[PDB]
Design a protein around this ligand. Sequence first.
Ligand code: NI
Ligand SMILES: [Zn+2]
Length: 331
Amino acid sequence: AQNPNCNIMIFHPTKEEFNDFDKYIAYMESRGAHRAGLAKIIPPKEWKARETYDNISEILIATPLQQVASGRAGVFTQYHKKKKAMTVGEYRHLANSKKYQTPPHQNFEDLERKYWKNRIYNSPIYGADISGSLFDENTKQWNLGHLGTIQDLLEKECGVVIEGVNTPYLYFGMWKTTFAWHTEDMDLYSINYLHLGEPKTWYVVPPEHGQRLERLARELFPGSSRGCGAFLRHKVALISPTVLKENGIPFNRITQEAGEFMVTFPYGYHAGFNHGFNCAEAINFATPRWIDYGKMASQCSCGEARVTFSMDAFVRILQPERYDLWKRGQD
Ligand code: NI
Ligand SMILES: [Zn+2]
């Protein structure tokens, strides 16, 4: 029972330890990293996702989303308004303009205070959920497009490809661009690499305390709780760290810099924001340990959020001795 305080652990793999992705995930879990819900991984010195980040200005952001928030005192609901297509070059210019740029700050505590206090103002534009990857095909270690985990069973056994789940998503962010409180689809793991730019702050609740966050969310959004039994699947709730601390919700905060990986573990609730212009890439993955989490993931009741995929192939192939038991439990 390592990591008793559910601290966010930072890992420094050697070049050799960076070869087998699944093996390093298991090593991190042997150290209790998953208890925090998130871990940071610093890649070895000479490792690189790609040679250079030139020629990225021409990338198409077909549907940038304006993230409109409404609320106050650290509790907000966010909705996405569709905007017209832009290039990464135009987006970077907009992010670095006087209206959207990172406001002056003394330190993190000051920037964090400005983000939570002024959230309803100057609704940021997020170049989120773009199908694609910036990892060079030559990169053979921790290439998000080719992690080689058991999640490959979805496409291998069923021919099912879901954008962002088993294919990478690119995210071009700007100051105040936000990711609302959520666990991954099917309570999968996720991995995020910050290719370039300004930091990304993450808030994370330890998986053992996930229900405490759900209880607080039900009390903060009573209308949403009456309509859906898993409304955090909607991914629209913003809850500040001050509100978490006031309500005794255990959490940790860590900031991710460019060149660093962040891994989220099954049922690790997380939320955060981008400090300024940046580009991150993310994808889901799975291990044999996740199958029990996937089998029990609470799904959206109202239909606003999807039931991403069936657990059938995973149970039938990787837990065959428990397949009939799983089937009887599904009715
Ligand atoms: Ni996530
Ligand atoms: Zn719902």
